[PDB]
Amino acid sequence: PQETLNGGITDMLTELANFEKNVSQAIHKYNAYRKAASVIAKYPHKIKSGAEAKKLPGVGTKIAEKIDEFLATGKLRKLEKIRQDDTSSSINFLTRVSGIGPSAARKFVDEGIKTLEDLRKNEDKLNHHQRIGLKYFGDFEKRIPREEMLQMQDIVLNEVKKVDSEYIATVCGSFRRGAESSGDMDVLLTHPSFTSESQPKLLHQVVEQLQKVHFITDTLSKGETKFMGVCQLPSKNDEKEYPHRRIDIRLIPKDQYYCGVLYFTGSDIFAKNMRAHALEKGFTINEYTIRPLGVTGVAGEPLPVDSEKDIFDYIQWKYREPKDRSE
Template sequence: MALVPLKRRRRASSPPAGPPGPGRFPAVVLCLVEKRMGASRRAFLTQLARAKGFRVDRAYSAAVTHVVSEQNSGAEVAQWLEQQREECGAEGDPALLDISWFTESMGAGRPVEIESRHRLRGGWQMAPYACQRRTPLLHSNQPLTEALETLAEEAGFSGSEGRSLAFTRAASVLKALPGRLSTLEELGPLPGIGEHSRRVIQDVLEDGVCAEVERVKLSERYQTMKLFTKIFGVGVRTASRWYQEGLRTLVDLQERGTKLTRQQQAGLRHYDDLNTPVERGEAESISRAVQGAVQRCLPGTSVTLAGGFRRGKPHGHDVDLLLTHPEAGREAGLLSRVVSWLDSQDLILYQHSQENSYALQEGPEPPGGRDVMDRFERCFSIFRLEVQGGPGAARGWKAVRVDLVVAPISQFPFALLGWTGSRHFERELRRFASHERKMVLNSHALYDSRRVWQLWAYVGTWG
């Protein structure tokens, strides 16, 4: 019996590497997830969509506006999207859609409006600690996070640190979401979002604003506290006392002869400048000036721009600079010489220095005690920066807040981490170290708290 030759199965042709063009709908760029869809079906759907005038990209990029998946949960596609972003280095905020949207769009011959039923369900997955999550500088839920951060700030003004932290944690979760939140149900059981935060989120999603947040913004106390705490050297406690005394404006502080510290006097005198955003170019200019002073005083010393600028922000409210020398101990006495030289060049409008008060032999903070994060030698200063335009252009300069921090080389990695921020990221990192690793992390060191306390308990028996 003659054997009938088997027909070779034709391989599905892969779509071209690049898109054929913008198509009929230039505002829509599709990317099909191959997982569970398969290469053959993906190739077929790609050809179908292109035939109907849709642009379909084979690989994910920042241009992609719609990610279409079949038989995958929202969490799975969100994870896929994170991997794609890491591989190609592209951001973007595409809609994560079920194949049903694609099918309806093909039937209509145009992109149909995205409805709630089209969006992938199953909830987003989220690590419990903010330090484990990827948080982009620009995110898709700005109105929601601004509302929560307003309530966090108001809670802080009222002395309720617990409420303030709860709203801050909820806002950090929304910042880390891979896409724009459309309904409250999409949050699922994500960590860090309590009932109060969910009510705020629902109000903003449904009405565009939250009545509670609007009341806070319009309240006299909130506006006054916000005004006073923007003064260099004024904290919540001082601002609250001034409010209780009936002070409401900056003019009130001057006319009523309010007793101010030297730091607060400088902050009030340069209030407008210090509350004008510092641009990256300005921060780098100040960094170069400090670097020049440092090299005059101690060649080989490094100056590192930290804070929000190190995180990639284009502007900030101050400039944080870390100074260290590769030889242990050489940094001693450096700060005073640097500040004196800068002052001699008329670059310092105000300065107040503090000595290094950290010593490992003092032992760690007691369990549950106050967490002193930073005891480095430092100088809180107001820098005189020459400018060509913008605020201060008429007089040729503007005042800028600058913190100079000296870290011994052995502690520099921890100092750099601590001074890079953000504040919430650092808080969560310490919480992770404590709860998950049973270790203590601060801007000076990382150590096993159990072993240190065992050692100190043993040493204590000698006395």
């Protein structure tokens, strides 16, 4: 359903969601406002009344009243006032710097740091992550066209195989689902010599090669299974510079790899469907394993998985291509 259908309401709702998360630190109300925004964004009718909205799962009494106020007046008094509040609106904004969450934003605004200029004057008060996110504030909100993602996949798959031809790397995320643009790049990495029961240099070596061919330009965090960093395509001769992009690489054991691929392919809207669909068959699936429930409820040992397809066979579900997986 198009935006102009209920876009007024979902924008209200997402705005209320962010103020809950970033200012009031009410994460559950943040998820509430998003559950309603999402169920409403899919509702294929221009909502005429808050009561009409309340029929949808996740829209309850208090949101329904906000939809009334918005429909009568075109605005929400509480949101207008908060949008004009210097403190709250500053707190809310600085959380757009990756590395600054609600807690650090509030503490910056407490001491009167309120803008990117204020963050630039006070670099010594930022951690490493925050400086990188500050450095790339703009770049990080630009989206990645599939053409650039493909070029990025070319570099990643090539340099991984060049380190060790026995690595398997899959670029997951929306990209894997045909998405015409992406928000970041999500790489899963596995290797024969890495299993549930079993060097720590396996991930570090892949990061090192991508840093050495100047693909990876900064490191947000790094450990033995999860990498969070920044990358950029080489510049096309005299032509312009690409944006720096968010890239994550994570190392998964061989026998947990396809559970990971499915998990980190998403969408979450599809993913939680398929673990509750799916719970009926007496199976539970986290990112790692699939296991059987369980006649009072005891999960058994994890069942072998050798393809993304297998986890569809256990559930007696039709295999779904990544491309048909937005829900």
